Amino acid sequence: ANKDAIRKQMDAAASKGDVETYRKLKAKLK
Amino acid sequence: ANKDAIRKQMDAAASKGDVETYRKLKAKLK
Amino acid sequence: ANKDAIRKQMDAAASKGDVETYRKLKAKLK
Amino acid sequence: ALNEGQIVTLAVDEIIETISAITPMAQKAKKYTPPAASMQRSSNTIWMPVEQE
Amino acid sequence: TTSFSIPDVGLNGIFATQGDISTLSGLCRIALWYGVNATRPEAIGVGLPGQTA
Amino acid sequence: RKLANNVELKVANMAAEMGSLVITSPDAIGTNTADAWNFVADAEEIMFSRELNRDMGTSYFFNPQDYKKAGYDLTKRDIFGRIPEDDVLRSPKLPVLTKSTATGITVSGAQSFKPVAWQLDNDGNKVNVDNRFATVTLSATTGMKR
Amino acid sequence: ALNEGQIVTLAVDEIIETISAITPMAQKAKKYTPPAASMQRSSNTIWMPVEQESPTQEGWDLTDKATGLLELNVAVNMGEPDNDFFQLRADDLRDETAYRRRIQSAARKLANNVELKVANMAAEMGSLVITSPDAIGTNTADAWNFVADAEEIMFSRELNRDMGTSYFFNPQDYKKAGYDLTKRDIFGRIPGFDDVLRSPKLPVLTKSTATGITVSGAQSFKPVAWQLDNDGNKVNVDNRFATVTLSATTGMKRGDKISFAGVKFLGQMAKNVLAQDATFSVVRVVDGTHVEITPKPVALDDVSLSPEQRAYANVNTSLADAMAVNILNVKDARTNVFWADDAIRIVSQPIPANHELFAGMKTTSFSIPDVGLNGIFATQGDISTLSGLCRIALWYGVNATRPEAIGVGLPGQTA
Amino acid sequence: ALNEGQIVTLAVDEIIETISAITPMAQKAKKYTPPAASMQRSSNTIWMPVEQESPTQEGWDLTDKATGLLELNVAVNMGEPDNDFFQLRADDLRDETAYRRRIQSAARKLANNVELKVANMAAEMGSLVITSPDAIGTNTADAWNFVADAEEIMFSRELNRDMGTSYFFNPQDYKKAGYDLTKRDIFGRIPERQVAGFDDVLRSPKLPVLTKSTATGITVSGAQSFKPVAWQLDNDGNKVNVDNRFATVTLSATTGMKRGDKISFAGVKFLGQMAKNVLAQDATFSVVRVVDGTHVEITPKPVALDDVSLSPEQRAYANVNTSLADAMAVNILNVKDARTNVFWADDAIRIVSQPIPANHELFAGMKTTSFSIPDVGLNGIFATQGDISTLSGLCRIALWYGVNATRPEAIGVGLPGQTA
Amino acid sequence: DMGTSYFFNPQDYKKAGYDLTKRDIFGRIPEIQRQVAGFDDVLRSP
């Protein structure tokens, strides 16, 4: 649910190449 | 949270030049 | 004349304390 | 890049907190405030009474 | 000049700044005006270990 | 930090050079009951016997060597040993009291001191007398220092 | 199954996580960032200020008391960046996990290099040497309390600019001392103080074969603010290091700890003689009769030097004509290091990069916040090997500023 | 009548124009602006690179060009600023002209001192020393041709392959050489390209007098060999660049030796930089400092061509036929006191300057404004403050700059009259 | 610069002075691993 949505968002951020957003979302996930 | 708002109040007090209010707000922050 | 207007603007610039525009107008004078 | 008020506030806060922190002996000594507080630079000889026996 | 006070220790001071062109920098002065008095020296003790003589 | 240095150095030097309740022992400070010296216990005993403590307790200050030798844990204490939120503390500004080389010193004559409340100064007014210090005439004062 | 953006993001994330985990010692040392921001000139010899010490300055009237200040400095050389230049093959890039594993393997090597740098510097130019003939343990009778001794030597010296001291044990001595380690993390941190933790990368300080060596002459060292270089300009002087002439520098290495006999420490701030002998660490053997010892011995009872120079005194008395060196590391032992707040500084600048200026390589800049390290991540396509070159560069300079505040604990120095 | 803004603007304008117009010597030096801008009072040692041209490669395929040459850096330190502290009396502030005149006098002082520093650098750090008993004069029978000799020694060493050489004459030798001052300013510039050429001969009255060396019979001790090395480990264990300009040698004794002396080992001969051909001219070395009573440092690092240990990339950096032998004689050159004439190549002296780190408007007591002189390349500060002692203002103009004698082998000093 | 895995037979594990307190039957911890950080792991296996 929420974990899946966060995973999709961080995957999109990584695909965009934005490291900062990916790191923030990784912090939120765990 | 409110810590970032009281930090802005601390900065405003410091820029004004009131040591007493700055110290009170710093004690509040901690 | 151009020289008188340049001198007036030079005095106005020197009154405010700006050295860059003063030097530029001096260069235009030469 | 610190404005004048910020200079004063930061300096006074730092002085107060660090001196109050690293003075163990001076905080165990009794604090005396002279009754006569006047705007004079000459050092007066304050006579505090001792306990009467 | 800004006058401050340290409540925990009981010291009164002043903090002053001024600009000097003989140093191209802002002079800063912190003063602490205090007098330590040993009232009743009979109550102050000194412990001296290892006085073998 | 320099200003706090000056304050603490002044207090420690004044306490060491003006303190008169002197307690000495040939042994060194430690936790060994047989061979070490209990500085805190002796200080408390001499202050209680002498009755100069208004019953609020005294304040003991160790130097770091003797504080370590006295077996104080310091883990549940501040850097000075203040139990942050017996009050035994340690200070690094405690001076070393150099030995005195005077050997053959005797009182010069029969001297008696009395507490004097006031005296007349040169202008003729009355000025209080500091009744702490008494001037003693001795045979010789060689090797004696403040 | 990895696109370029995901490659960059995963690589930067894995580098940051791996470096920030396996580096406990570099995180305890103060992080410094210089405003210079030089570009591929080995940076510069960044001259770093050191805390000022001044005389009393008592009285209402102070006319010219602000002119005699010394303003000493210390220098750090960033040097050249530490790289890990390898190839990325299709095996590594097939899946996120394999790529993260490869990037972690690279970042772990870089982090280990950082850790050995810090540990070796702390062990080889730490001055506050504490040695005991007994091994570290819990028993009060036959064992040695390293933490208590280190805390006391820091407190008496008044070298702890008050934030707390960091204690580092090698894992053997950490186990010997009574530390739980079950409720703590891998290194002993919490996710006498609470800064005690263990580091595998602590080196071993080998013996010193020097025996019966004495000072050659009567040297007195005084703090110097600046000196004229060969160009006639004014260059600052690194006042940490003092060149002392000995009778014979035989058996002396870069890590030996020496303590001249008859010389005792002073409280850095109170200027009172301590019981502990002043211990120095030799950092270079210049000649057969000259060495460099990492704390400069400034004598209180030295009339040659001015009061502004006397404010920096850390030694009871200057070196006499024939004083004994008194080598301290007399047996091989793994070192335990401890230091104050500002005793080691990691200086780093962002690596100068012109991103997207040259097409062909993708360069991204990453900064580890936990450890003051800045880096660059570069990927290029190599048609010769039909794969992709990958480079991870870390640019940092680890500086042992204030070597007097770095200590080495040497157990077992029986004889 | 002047207000504070007019004071600041007029003073900065006068300083910039006067300092730009006065100094010719600093113009000839190649200005270098550090990439780093620092907020610290103690300037970091700027390690600026020294570039020797790589030989061009021709062909379509350059995969095998390689030959990454040794990258060597020289260190420049910025001293304490050179400042002119003076009182702005009420007379100087009466109108515009008096203020311009006073600021012009201050700028003249500062510019003269800058020229003095550059001239002392060139005289005491110049390596190419040419001497003979004769004195400079127009006639060829019994006099010098300083320009011709300097041009010949520069062409033989191949130091200035493309750019021109700047020749500086003291006024006496400038008059003796036959150069007329008619329709010319004080320094010999004509009152009036940049890409190439621009060979000029100027007269500079700031050239110092080189005192003779009262040292005889000094011999080299040991066998010294020097190799240009790009990096070394400092005490912290980090890597620091090595100033490969200065090499310290061991001598029998350093008595009678000072900074300004010139030496020339007997068996050592110069080499063409681009061809490594032995030249008939004896190799000339200039001392910078006397380290001890036994060691001494010299401006050109003697790197012998016949060195087996020398790497090819290191062998590219060669200016000596054979290293110092066991008992070679120093053979001091400057034997008589004489005013020096200095010449140098395009990039043989660099002026390094960065803005003075100061925060403005925080302290209301003083008014500090930062100015820059782009023509000369000196960054400075202008400060004023009111003094109750003199019932007027105190003004201070501080210039912060560092002169570096990069490539000292390309700086030539020629002192005539060395009869004995 | 990583950990090493040590496997003892049970008797030499006992004789070397290794305890099984807060460890499973093989000497492992019941719960970036320790090996990556550079810490050795001592186990016993029959």
Residue numbers in the entry:
A (entry chain L), B (entry chain J), C (entry chain N): 271 to 300
D (entry chain B): 2 to 54
E (entry chain B): 378 to 430
F (entry chain B): 109 to 193, 209 to 269
G (entry chain A): 2 to 192, 207 to 430
H (entry chain G): 2 to 193, 203 to 430
I (entry chain F): 163 to 193, 201 to 215
Tell me, in the authors' exact words, what the paper reports.
There are seven subunits of the coat protein gp5 in the procapsid asymmetric unit, that is, six for the hexon and one for the penton. We built atomic models for the seven gp5 subunits based on our 2.6 Å resolution density map of the procapsid. The gp5 structure can be divided into six domains, namely, the N-arm (residues 2–30), P-domain (residues 31–33, 79–127, and 358–416), insertion (I-, residues 222–345), A-domain (residues 128–221, 346–357, and 417–430), E-loop (residues 51–78), and F-loop (residues 34–50). The gp5 subunits in the procapsid are closely linked to each other through electrostatic interactions. We identified the inter-subunit salt bridges between E81 and K249 in the two neighboring gp5 subunits, respectively, and between D246 and R255 in the two neighboring gp5 subunits, respectively. In our structure, W48 was located in the F-loop, where it formed a hydrogen bond with T46 in the neighboring gp5 subunit, which is consistent with the results of a previous biochemical study that reported the mutation W48Q to decrease the stability of the procapsid shell. There were U-shaped structures of a helix-turn-helix motif anchored on the inner surface of the procapsid around the icosahedral fivefold axes and local sixfold axes. The quality of the U-shaped structure was further improved by the asymmetric averaging of the seven U-shaped structures in the asymmetric unit, allowing us to build an atomic model of the C-terminal residues (271–300) of the 303-residue scaffolding protein gp8 into the U-shaped structure. The C-terminus of gp8 in the asymmetric unit was anchored to the inner capsid through electrostatic interactions mediated by R293 and K296 in the helix-loop-helix of gp8 and D14, E15, and E18 in the gp5 N-arm domain. In addition, S285 in gp8 formed a hydrogen-bond interaction with N4 in gp5, and Y292 in gp8 formed a cationic π interaction with R101 in gp5; these interactions further stabilized the scaffolding protein in the capsid.
